[PDB]
Amino acid sequence: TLHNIITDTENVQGSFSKHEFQAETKKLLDIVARSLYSEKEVFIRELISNGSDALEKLRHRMITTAPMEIHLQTDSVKGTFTIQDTGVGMNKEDLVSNLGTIARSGSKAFLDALQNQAEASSSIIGQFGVGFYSAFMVADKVEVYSQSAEADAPGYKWSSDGSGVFEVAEASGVRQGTKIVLHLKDDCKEFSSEDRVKEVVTKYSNFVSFPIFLNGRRLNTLQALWMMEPKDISEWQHEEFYRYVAQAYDKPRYTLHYRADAPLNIRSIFYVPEMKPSMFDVSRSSVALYSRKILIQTKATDILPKWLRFLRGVVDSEDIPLNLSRELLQESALIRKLRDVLQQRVIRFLLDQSKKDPEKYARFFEDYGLFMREGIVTTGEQSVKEDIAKLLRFESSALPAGQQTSLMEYSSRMKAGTRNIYYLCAPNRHLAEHSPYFEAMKQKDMEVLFCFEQFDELTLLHLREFDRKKLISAATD
Amino acid sequence: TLHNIITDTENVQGSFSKHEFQAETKKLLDIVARSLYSEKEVFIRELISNGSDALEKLRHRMITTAPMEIHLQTDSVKGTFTIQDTGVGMNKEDLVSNLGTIARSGSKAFLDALQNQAEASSSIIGQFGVGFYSAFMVADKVEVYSQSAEADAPGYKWSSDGSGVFEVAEASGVRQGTKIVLHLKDDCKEFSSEDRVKEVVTKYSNFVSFPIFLNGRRLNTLQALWMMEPKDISEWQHEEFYRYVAQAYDKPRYTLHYRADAPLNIRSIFYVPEMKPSMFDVSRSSVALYSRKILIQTKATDILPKWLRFLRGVVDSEDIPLNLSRELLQESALIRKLRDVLQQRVIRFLLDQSKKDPEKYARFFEDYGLFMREGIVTTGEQSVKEDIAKLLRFESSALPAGQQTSLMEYSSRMKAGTRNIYYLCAPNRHLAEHSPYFEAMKQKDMEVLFCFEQFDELTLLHLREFDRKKLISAATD
Ligand SMILES: Nc1ncnc2c1ncn2[C@@H]1O[C@H](COP(=O)(O)OP(=O)(O)NP(=O)(O)O)[C@@H](O)[C@H]1O
Ligand SMILES: Nc1ncnc2c1ncn2[C@@H]1O[C@H](COP(=O)(O)OP(=O)(O)NP(=O)(O)O)[C@@H](O)[C@H]1O
Ligand SMILES: [Mg+2]
Ligand SMILES: [Mg+2]
């Protein structure tokens, strides 16, 4: 019944002509202005990232003093937004080449030149060569004044409406660094409001490693603690940071400050709140994803497994694959790897807490144990079920009332002939201890886990086995 | 305490030099190959869209016969994917200009030339001028053979590795139209598997308006019914289409085929299944978003309000704002407008069903009424609550048992002195009718709504008022 037309019929008839790929810059400008970003406000993120990059370059050539700052100014009656950094600036060649050429970035050349890259490569944000054009999403006119930190280089003014052409002229009175003035479009006047700009900086950019001022007021006093050496962060600093990133008023019960370079770059701080979890926490994460100190996503969907959604804090990775709009490239293998790494590290962290302070862990488990049970029921990977299962606590017939035990402690108490873990679910210990089911087990000198919570029975039935041992309900026959 | 540095100090010193924006094509190619699409499989979507566009152009110059088809061929041992269309093809100028220039599209020029655009503008998919380069995500070598439908124009071979350069030569034996051969990268050999390609076509492209064949087998027999005149679609065609798009085995209880041009373009079909809703339907949409017959999103997040997640079907709009990757540009005003339009139209549709066949509607309400109650509780907009409230059904003291009434029917029966709607929640009618609360009301000759479902009381308390009338529980005092 087949119907094909694909057939190998073609042969080349003439000499080949060689050609370079070209680009329609006017369309590209339009695409970047209208078809890349879902929200126009990210132009502020992009200009601040450029200011930071320029300052980072200056910091490196400070070997070889000057204040390294980013200033923002709003003027409502003028309808302008201005950003000025005290960074490396641009000479005429740089202005024409780097600003005038889409997809051209000064990042690679700066990094390559530096003898040792590691430190600078971590700090430099820009990689695509398009971020500057985000200005034209919101501005009818863009003027750039720049003065390079070179020998006796002159100052320059670069100007454009984003309509295919720009102009450059020598300029006097330009301070070292770069000032960008945006004359905002009529439908974008909100970015000449101080409160509005403050919200955008707080959202994306406040953890930038240089002071940001808005109309003279410091916006970003709080530092990116995740980058720092964990021992140099006091308990008080963690309380304060937790409250800020969690938008909370309580304090953290637990703090895990995790840094790794292998198998991927991770700089992270996680907190467990002291308050018991809300019904929206249980309903449905509040961990935010950063890359090189800039926000990528405010609520992970998802760099953590669902059952860890009770965690608060920040994960920063240099290795996050970004799309051109600087959102996450979805479901990359690196994200799945990151998620698995974090799950393993948090499980081990919580396990370590249960051994360091059982009383405190017990309080944690009363309140957050539901998430563990859910995590076990949710996955079909046995190794994951069994790892999360290590976090579970139960009472036991072999222990006095109120005393909690783990599956691992139970198993350590078994005898080598045996491969069954017995449990009995009941509203409370008195009824467990006086169940006919328990007397049977008691005859056989078999220890029984007592399970009073929900959904304890369902969890254990899902878990099925633990450490090669069958989970068997005593409440039968 | 202020600390500023932003000061108006600059003046231009020299003449301005004028410059055109330029582009670094090598970086752009890299960005498109690595930083745009979250899944490499969309190259198939993009090449098929191009085939469709080429065929649509041919269809128009058929005024002024030939079969209009898209063929795919996989060859596993060769590691190739081939697509050939019998469309308008490209001459040398077109090959060099359109394929060789990123962000350059032949769409505008074709549309502008046509005396009447409306029909063609609806059919033509391409707008950015980048889709072709998606081939380099998966191929090390791309060869294009094309023959224009012109007077005595010769055939051509265009060839590239996506490394900045390409070659063009005259070629013999090229059939009218365009054939593209991809030599797949080692990590992309899955696209030389027939089953894999079939999955991708089914996912994005099967509703394209031209037959698609894969290794000689027709893939897309089922047509995009949403575009058609509603009366030309039989009940049987709707059953079949419903089962396909809902991945279901039952049949639709209700069918709403909605087309509008104002205030925006909408071509849509919604179905309510006859089966009662599953626990994942209730847990958490299965309406898919299309644009010009190509998938944009398979599960709306979200073009419908949450409470309408029980609907199945397809919404197609020419007006969907797309980002460069051809995902939805998030939270555009047009999406919110679309959502509101659809909500209004579905509410009116269901209201019309309750009047056309109350018995059938009653069956619908038993099973799906939970979604209405949820929708009322979820929103804070009173006009929306009251519109969804029109869908609610209750028993009444003024009607015989089993008979259902609406809030509007209740209100029509009130007397002009009165502004209260009374209700009584109870497990069943017998207990309602014999409640002491009801006797009180019965004394005052006041009609009482009897509410046996959950969460009836909560819903009515949230609703608060209806048509300027207070909802008041009789179960007090
Ligand atoms: N404030 C600034 N100071 C100095 N140089 C700047 C400044 N802003 C932009 N540049 C230069 O202009 C180039 C283009 O900036 P931009 O379009 O943001 O691309 P990018 O920073 O290189 N990469 P990306 O932000 O990922 O798109 C930068 O690489 C710098 O070389
Ligand atoms: N199969 C084809 N037949 C004829 N012309 C084609 C074909 N494929 C590509 N072209 C031409 O090459 C141009 C570039 O294609 P492409 O890069 O997909 O951009 P586009 O279709 O115009 N817009 P978009 O798909 O939104 O990126 C098209 O506009 C056509 O002019
Ligand atoms: Mg940048
Ligand atoms: Mg295309």
UniProtKB/TrEMBL annotation, chains A, B:
Keyword check for Phosphoprotein: yes
Positions contributing to Ca(2+) 1 binding: 98, 101, 104, 129
Primary subcellular site in the record, as a coarse category: mitochondrion
Binding-site positions, ATP: 46, 50, 85, 90, 98, 105-106, 127-132, 178, 326
Cellular component, GO, one term: mitochondrial inner membrane
Binding site for Mg(2+) 2: 50
Amino-acid positions noted as binding Ca(2+) 2 in the UniProt annotation, renumbered to this chain: 98, 104, 129, 133
Protein name: Heat shock protein 75 kDa, mitochondrial
Gene: trap1
